[PDB]
Design an enzyme around this catalytic site. Structure first.
Site, short mmCIF file in Angstrom:
data_model
loop_
_atom_site.label_atom_id
_atom_site.label_comp_id
_atom_site.label_asym_id
_atom_site.label_seq_id
_atom_site.Cartn_x
_atom_site.Cartn_y
_atom_site.Cartn_z
N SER A 91 13.25 -25.39 32.33
CA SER A 91 11.99 -26.06 32.62
C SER A 91 11.04 -25.16 33.42
O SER A 91 9.86 -25.48 33.46
CB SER A 91 12.21 -27.38 33.32
OG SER A 91 12.91 -28.30 32.48
C1 LIG Z 1 16.71 -32.87 35.52
C2 LIG Z 1 15.34 -32.31 35.17
C3 LIG Z 1 14.26 -33.12 35.88
S1 LIG Z 1 15.03 -32.50 33.35
C4 LIG Z 1 14.12 -30.91 33.26
C5 LIG Z 1 14.71 -29.90 32.23
C6 LIG Z 1 14.27 -28.46 32.55
O1 LIG Z 1 14.87 -27.76 33.32
N1 LIG Z 1 16.15 -29.90 31.98
C7 LIG Z 1 16.66 -30.28 30.80
O2 LIG Z 1 15.99 -30.83 29.93
C8 LIG Z 1 18.16 -30.04 30.61
N2 LIG Z 1 18.33 -29.91 29.18
C9 LIG Z 1 19.11 -28.97 28.62
O3 LIG Z 1 19.83 -28.24 29.30
N3 LIG Z 1 19.02 -28.83 27.21
C10 LIG Z 1 19.68 -27.64 26.66
C11 LIG Z 1 19.27 -27.67 25.21
N4 LIG Z 1 18.37 -28.81 25.06
C12 LIG Z 1 18.13 -29.38 26.27
O4 LIG Z 1 17.19 -30.12 26.54
C13 LIG Z 1 19.04 -31.12 31.22
C14 LIG Z 1 19.89 -30.84 32.28
C15 LIG Z 1 20.67 -31.83 32.87
C16 LIG Z 1 20.62 -33.12 32.38
C17 LIG Z 1 19.80 -33.42 31.32
C18 LIG Z 1 19.02 -32.43 30.74
N5 LIG Z 1 14.08 -30.34 34.62
C19 LIG Z 1 15.26 -30.78 35.38
C20 LIG Z 1 15.13 -30.34 36.85
O5 LIG Z 1 13.96 -30.31 37.32
O6 LIG Z 1 16.18 -30.02 37.45
#
Ligand SMILES: CC1(C)S[C@H]([C@@H](C=O)NC(=O)[C@H](NC(=O)N2CCNC2=O)c2ccccc2)N[C@H]1C(=O)O
Length: 325
Positions: A61
């Protein structure tokens, strides 16, 4: 000769290790860049190799500010525009946020970290335009920092991309960066839209950036990013007393035989201050925390708070608003 500040270096070391131990994590890194020169002021790794330069991770992210910048720079998106942020499909696979909103404006997308919203902003450009933009940010590019084992990252060529890849890259997956390439890229945000070279020597001549976005657009993006560190934003733990901070959180699942696993995470946190006219960039990553949470916010926010707040002090930068402590 060296640009590393021993006091920031020491502060970064102590706090890194306090977090790694506390969270029972495998490894971690901190970089601190000069936000206007690209000089490295600090760079620390848990013991072992220089992971900051040698290792590449998926940004997740902490990538999203960049498609957002791109949208705004083009003239095609305004900061107030609203987007449909429901789950949607591209062929088989599905793109979604962890918390569902039906719409978010651009500021919502940043503050909440909406995968869908970022990918809707990405989707207005050709594969070539997004590739060219990521390349100009230094993704997949050698920096020639002067460190050995320097990772170039990975940026698959746009002629090869399946449609889902454009989207997933926009919110940080299917492409790879050293923490140092990632910190560097943020100089576009901090140095009025010009990517800076990075170096561990004190420099004797002003370094020349390459223009990537307008000065006006970086300014707008930095302001959007202040929402991340205030109430309703995912990086509230990262707030520094006395200062507005532009930051971005990122939590990524890890690749084990090319499939994403739900019991293994990388926590990242990158930010800069003062938000309106930054002096410094601070970047933290921690790999595979096992205790006391796994989210960027709780794992890497505190580390960032202490390294940023102590850097601003050490460099003789005064608080821009009054303390609440
Ligand atoms: C928990 C959040 C708020 S979601 C968002 C985001 C970006 O980092 N993270 C994700 O979208 C991450 N997805 C992920 O790793 N994958 C891999 C392939 N496709 C996919 O979406 C994730 C991690 C843990 C639980 C749920 C989702 N930022 C996190 C922050 O700020 O810690």
């Amino acid at each position: 000769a060296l640009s590393l500040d021993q006091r920031i270096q020491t502060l970064a070391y102590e706090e890194l290790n306090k977090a790694v131990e506390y969270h029972q994590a495998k490894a971690g890194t901190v970089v601190v860049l000069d936000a206007r020169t690209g000089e490295i002021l600090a760079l620390v790794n848990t013991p072992g190799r220089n992971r900051a330069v040698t290792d590449m991770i998926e940004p997740g992210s902490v990538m999203k500010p960049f498609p957002i910048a791109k949208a705004l720079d083009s003239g095609k998106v305004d900061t107030t525009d609203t987007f449909n942020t429901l789950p949607y499909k591209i062929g088989p696979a599905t793109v979604q946020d962890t918390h569902v909103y039906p719409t978010l404006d651009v500021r919502g997308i940043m503050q909440k970290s909406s995968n869908v919203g970022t990918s809707k902003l990405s989707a207005m450009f050709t594969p070539k335009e997004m590739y060219d933009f990521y390349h100009d940010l230094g993704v997949g590019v050698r920096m020639h920092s002067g460190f050995p084992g320097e990772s170039a990252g990975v940026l698959r060529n746009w002629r090869k991309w399946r449609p889902i890849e454009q989207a997933t890259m926009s919110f940080g997956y299917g492409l790879q960066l050293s923490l140092l390439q990632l910190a560097r890229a943020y100089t576009v945000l901090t140095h009025d839209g010009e990517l800076l070279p990075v170096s561990f020597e004190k420099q004797a001549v002003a370094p020349k950036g390459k223009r990537v976005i307008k000065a006006s657009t970086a300014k707008k993006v930095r302001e959007l990013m202040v929402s991340v560190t205030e109430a309703g934003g995912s990086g509230i733990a990262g707030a520094v007393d006395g200062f507005d901070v532009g930051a971005k959180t990122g939590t990524a699942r890890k690749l084990v035989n090319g499939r994403y696993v739900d019991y293994k995470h990388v926590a990242t946190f990158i930010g800069f201050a003062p938000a309106k006219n930054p002096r410094v960039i601070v970047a933290v990553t921690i790999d595979e925390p096992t205790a006391n949470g796994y989210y960027s916010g709780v794992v890497t926010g505190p580390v960032f708070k202490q390294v940023m707040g102590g850097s601003l002090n050490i460099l003789g930068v005064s608080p821009t608003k009054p303390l609440t402590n």
